[PDB]
């Protein structure tokens, strides 16, 4: 198979007969989808599965030197989305949704019921292992080898999301944005809510620099792939250096 | 991900623990575990597309199918990625699961992590019962127990 | 197939179960393409080949009163275009092109060589009959029964386009817009250029009110359908009350 | 349009006059006339799509085909609207044409007025010579003489 990008080579092109020759070398070759040759730019974009070595040799086989200057894929995709459902021993239950707004900004938004009113630590942990309730889930997610922190700290565990407040009726409603967390990087890991407050590393307790002294882990879910509201984009029309895409919301 | 894990649960007495392990990059995946609480006989065993179980098997949706094919057994060339066939539940209602499969992966475009594993009510007819429903679900019918496949140590 | 317009009926609709019933009457009937049901508007658009009688009866067959309030077809089309090539016995040759800018404004633009310098009458005539040179072509095109005139006169023959000037070298280059002439209405008729000046009905000759005394007819062509620069539009995408169309120029 | 007319001409000796007449709305069209200057034998006889002959048969373009079908004889169900088959040119080089055809019209979507009538070099194979060119042109090849079909008194 080999998967297709678009390859951009730069070629010294001047006459229409040179352009005739460049197209000639890739005209109906095995595994080249589309060729496009911007003669103002002196450039040749190549929609193909083939390696850059092989394709450069076919252009150079005519007798022209073909310097590669870029590779890309005008495929478009949706922002990523996910959900974690929190359950465990007894009262605590909740749903938390994730949406990658930009590749640098993730939006987290959810609702957790049955909490002893006040502040509770919320953290992404390393494993999505619910075998032993919330204790099989491993540590705070920490691929950068940082010390535990609060969400307003540069030095923190990726998984550190600080605290959420349970109201009067034992219920936490929250929205937050986090720049170190990324939906693609946590699918299959776990979200966990804690017995009591995360001290954000500012407790001077032995656990502060490690868990923020948050207590027992009450409830956990796996951060699971969700369908978006929207379907995958579809190309409806193309030209030289233009594509037109449709994006329809899902039925239900 | 070398290893992953799933904890099956539902409303009924069906429950269990399934492990996944993969030793080579786009190699085979060993699938193994146990499931108590089942009726005796064969039960369908499927990775559905999404892990979102906020709305049950309507939100988890169909069999995981990135190559738009018809339903089949694991041994068929024409199959969904998620099709792992059947598990044998004994007289006591336990199924000791053991499977090897090189179409699912723990990475790349066939990665099952973050999706829902499901043990279904009836047996998987492997797409061979000859009707419209047979080539979507293999007439295994309703979900008994399900869980999100998560990363494991 | 070809008789596929879109029919709009107004229906007393209140509940979603009434809408369920309306769709029910047209669900999979022979020859109905698409149904669409704006319940804010209490309206039902019906993409179908069927007659309005028949479709009203199917809606009314449930027992509900279905007043028709419009018909249309969201098919899109190109502005119309045409060309006449002028030849004859003698020296004179030329090409004149027509383009219907708006349904009220036609653009005429052309070039005619081999003319005795100065002003020559140019007119669309009734028939595209080149059997007897330019004399088989009939009169000035005059479907509204007007008297001959110049292009700045309301009362004139549709076919009256006034005069064009042959320069130094016996060559007429001209552009004009005419609001009475219409490309669709002259395909298959003839364009003719004349020996001498059209007097615009102001000559006091017996021919003034009839031909403007323009002389022998030197050269004529039939006003022929031309491909135009652009291809027929193509629908690339639709939804409820939206369609997206592509329009590409011709390659060659 | 009840009646129409075409005057065929080229560079070579081929020339002629063809009349059209239609008495009922979507009725048949009588086609009749003569063409001198032809080689003996059969010659293709086609209404091409456009009447624009600024660039010859490249601007007049293909056989008039509003229903996107394959080339055929006039007697075939599968045909272009413009396909009127062949004319028989005798020893002296004259073809006395006389035809009836109910697929062309002088009105509506199959209206030939404003399009180019063409007598071609070789005979029309009626799409039956079995190749890609046979189902576009019927291998009648190049234009001999042509003219725009115009409205007639
Ligand atoms: Zn931490
Ligand atoms: Zn399946
Ligand atoms: Zn006049
Ligand atoms: Zn044809």
Residue numbers in the entry:
A (entry chain A), C (entry chain C): 8 to 259
B (entry chain B), D (entry chain D): 1 to 153
Q: What does the report in the manuscript say about this coordinate set?
A:
The very high positional dynamism necessary of the hCCS copper-binding domain is evidenced by intra-lattice conformational flexibility and a 47.4-Å domain movement between conformers. Conformational plasticity is therefore not restricted to the hCCS homodimer state but is an intrinsic property of the activating complex. Comparison of different hCCS conformers indicate that the C-terminal tail is also conformationally dynamic, as has been observed for the yeast orthologue and predicted from SAXS data for hCCS. The SOD1-like, hCCS domain II found within each complex structure has an intact intra-subunit disulphide bond in contrast to the yeast orthologue.
Superoxide dismutase-1 (SOD1) is one of the most abundant human proteins and is an important part of our antioxidant, redox signalling and respiratory control mechanisms. SOD1 folding, zinc and copper acquisition, and disulphide bond formation can be catalysed by the copper chaperone for SOD1 (CCS), which forms a transient heterodimeric complex with SOD1 to facilitate its maturation. Here, we discover the mechanisms that govern SOD1 maturation and stabilisation through interaction with the chaperone protein hCCS. Combinations of mutants yielded crystallographic structures of full-length hCCS in two different conformers complexed with hSOD1; an hCCS domain II truncation complexed with hSOD1; an hCCS domain II homodimer structure at higher resolution than previously available (1.55 Å); and the hSOD1 disulphide knock-out mutant used to promote complexation.
